[PDB]
Amino acid sequence: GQKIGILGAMREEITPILELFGVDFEEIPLGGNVFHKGVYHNKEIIVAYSKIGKVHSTLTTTSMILAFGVQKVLFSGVAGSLVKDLKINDLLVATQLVQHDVDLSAFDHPLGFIPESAIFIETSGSLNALAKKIANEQHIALKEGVIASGDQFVHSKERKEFLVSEFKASAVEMEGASVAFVCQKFGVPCCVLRSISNNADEKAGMSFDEFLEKSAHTSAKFLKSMVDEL
Ligand SMILES: Nc1ncnc2c1ncn2[C@@H]1O[C@H](CSCC[C@H](N)C(=O)O)[C@@H](O)[C@H]1O
């Protein structure tokens, strides 16, 4: 009898999800987004891609909670690896996220900090546990770690190094921190999943286009597993 929200940043990331669920989906348009509301194993699921960035992901998450009353939010998308032990197509679940492009240093504030907020945002302990359990049941090398979210596609060793030293981030993306932040403000458990589709290096743009499809599917599958266990 639950209500579960599922989000992707791109249409490419949620089409595999709608496929895998295989149920009739009702399409409700709202705020520039199209929500796919169906039913599945007695769980009401609302799926959608937010479009790219912090503004887009924040808007959609807030509508998904205030309009559809979803009780849990799962995110599935692709990301860029910042550390060497996280490889293309690997899976990672974010323990904590940060907004790496936030800079109020002119007020002598650490980077990533905003008054009345926090540098790190935590995700659901129960959902991350569930994710870990499942990964062992199918011998999947699921990884854990901090994820940096900003409104810039990271494609430079230089920035890559800034993110690992400053926040000790493992992967970089563009919608993680937004989604998790909003869920926290509304007290909704959030889980952020990401498949590595590139290395955030000079060759990142290229590496991204090639693995978009494979990565988006590794991610969609795992997540469908979690919705089954719910
Ligand atoms: N290295 C990286 N730096 C920032 N975001 C990355 C990233 N690798 C993957 N991402 C993620 O996947 C998307 C990359 S932006 C996609 C651009 C697309 N080719 C176009 O031109 O329309 C974002 O949703 C972001 O969350």
Residue pointed to by tokens 């993110």: 163
DSSP state of 10: S
Q: Which residue, 178, 187, 198, 191, is CA-closest to 222?
A: 191
User: Which helix or strand (DSSP H or E) is residue 79 part of?
Assistant: strand 72-81
Q: Are 34 and 28 in contact (CB under 8 A)?
A: yes
Provide the token pair at 24: 């009739």
Angle (nearest 5°) at CA 16 between 182 and 90: 75
Who lines ligand 1 at CB under 6 A? 9-10, 52, 77-80, 153-154, 172-175, 197-198, 200, 204, 208
Q: Which distant-in-sequence residues (6+ apart) come within 8 Å of 27 by Cβ? A: 34, 35, 36, 37
Alpha helices in the chain (DSSP H): 11-21, 54-66, 125-137, 157-167, 176-185, 204-229
- Could you write out the DSSP letters of every residue in 34-68? EEEE---SS-EEEEEE--SSHHHHHHHHHHHHHTT
Torsion sign (Cα): 24, 187, 145, 127 = negative
Q: What is the distance between the alpha carbons of residues 201 and 157, in angstroms, rounded to a whole number? A: 5
Atom of ligand 1 nearest to the CA of 150: 4
Q: Are 94 and 147 in contact (CB under 8 A)?
A: yes
Q: Are 191 and 93 in contact (CB under 8 A)?
A: yes
CATH of 1-230, one of 3.40.50.1580, 3.40.50.2300, 3.40.50.300, 3.30.1490.20: 3.40.50.1580
Q: Are 178 and 52 in contact (CB under 8 A)?
A: no
Residue pointed to by tokens 């959902």: 127
Resolution in A: 2.2
Q: Which distant-in-sequence residues (6+ apart) come within 8 Å of 63 by Cβ? A: 30, 31, 33
Angle (nearest 5°) at CA 186 between 182 and 190: 60
Atom of ligand 1 nearest to the CA of 9: 24
Q: What is the distance between the alpha carbons of residues 121 and 193, in angstroms, rounded to a whole number? A: 15
C-alpha to C-alpha distances, 32 to 28, 29, 49, 56, nearest whole angstrom: 10, 7, 11, 9
Ligand 1 centroid distance, CA of 174 (Å): 7
Method of elucidation: X-ray
Query: Which residue of 57, 174, 198 sits with most ligand 1 atoms within 8 Å of its CB, as the best mutation to test the pocket?
Result: 174
Report the 3 state secondary structure along 59-77.
HHHHHHHHCCCCCEEEEEE
Q: Are 45 and 21 in contact (CB under 8 A)?
A: yes
Phi, psi values for residue 197, rounded to 5°? -115, 0
Is 164 buried (19+), middle (13-18) or exposed (0-12) by CB count in 10 A? middle
Provide the token pair at 45: 């699921």
Ligand 1 centroid distance, CA of 160 (Å): 15
Q: What is the distance between the alpha carbons of residues 207 and 70, in angstroms, rounded to a whole number? A: 34
